[PDB]
Structure 1
Amino acid sequence: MGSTNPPPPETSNPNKPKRQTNQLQYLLRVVLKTLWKHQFAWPFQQPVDAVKLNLPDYYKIIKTPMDMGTIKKRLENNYYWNAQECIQDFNTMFTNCYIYNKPGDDIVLMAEALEKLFLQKINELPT
């Protein structure tokens, strides 16, 4: 009975309604893809691997995981109906980090930076 990770969030759901919208195209080509290249992005590029990291309490505490790798796959697979759904997934990811960790932790400074950038990039979206 050693530690395991949960199954990752779904990136495809054939019974969920979806659309391609100008705002969602923008969220992939501009926002995600620019954030993905940032020097602080790496911890957020894949689901939190609590086994590899030796944080057996991670998924004890965080029940709604989200990461940019999943968000990337959702955008590529046209999983979302609108921009707001995806913005919500970005917000879940940031929030989870702030929940599990504490002010001034390196990982938090990273998420804080990314979140400021995020906000500056989604300030104006296409119509």
Structure 2
Amino acid sequence: SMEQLKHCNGILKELLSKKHAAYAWPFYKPVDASALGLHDYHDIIKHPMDLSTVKRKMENRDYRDAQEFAADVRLMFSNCYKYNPPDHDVVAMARKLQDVFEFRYAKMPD
């Protein structure tokens, strides 16, 4: 399953690519709560995640298996859904990028 981790690296590169940039861009770097005017972000979200952090962990070889990679990507999306109202534009962007992630992850070789 070095081959599964290589497939995961391929997914990450697709999520960061210009093809999906219209809805992926909020997830590129950690949420900057003071830059967005959010006073309570870190009171609600105890474990932040974003694509730059997933990339650093992949480059460092911190992932023991594909399931750990999926847990981080799904955490990133879940924090967005937890913090925001369900009709919010950033939740619509999260769902569009999650559609791409779940479809590619499901096609991973066993």
Matched letter for residue 27 of structure 1: C
Tell me the CA shift for residue 74 of structure 1.
0.7
Describe the superposition over 1:45-80 as per-residue Cα deviations: whole angstroms up to 9, x where unpaired: 111110111112111100011111100111111111
1:115 aligned to which of 63, 73, 98: 98
Partner of 2:60: 77
- Give the CA deviation at 1:126: 2.7
Residue pairs, 1:52-67, within 5 angstroms:
52-67=35-50
Q: Say whether residues 1:50 and 2:33 are aligned partners.
A: yes
TM-score by length of 2: 0.92
The corresponding residue for 1:97 is 80
Aligned residues: 107
Structure 1 residue 110, shift from structure 2 partner = 0.4
Looking at secondary structure, tell me which structure has more helix per residue. 2
Amino acid at match of 2:81: Y
Question: Could you tell me which residue of structure 2 aligns to residue 33 of structure 1?
Answer: 13
Residue 22 in 1 paired to residue 3 in 2?
yes
Counterpart-to-counterpart distance in 1, 2:2 and 2:43: 36
Q: Which has more radius of gyration?
A: 1
Q: Name the counterpart of 1:4.
A: none
Query: Which structure 1 segments of 5+ residues have no match?
Result: 1-19
Q: Are residues 1:126 and 2:106 paired? A: no
What percent of counterpart residues are identical? 45
Q: Which runs of 4+ in 1 moved over 6 A?
A: none
Question: For structure 2, which runs of at least 5 residues remain unmatched after alignment?
Answer: none
TM-score norm. by structure 1 comes to 0.80
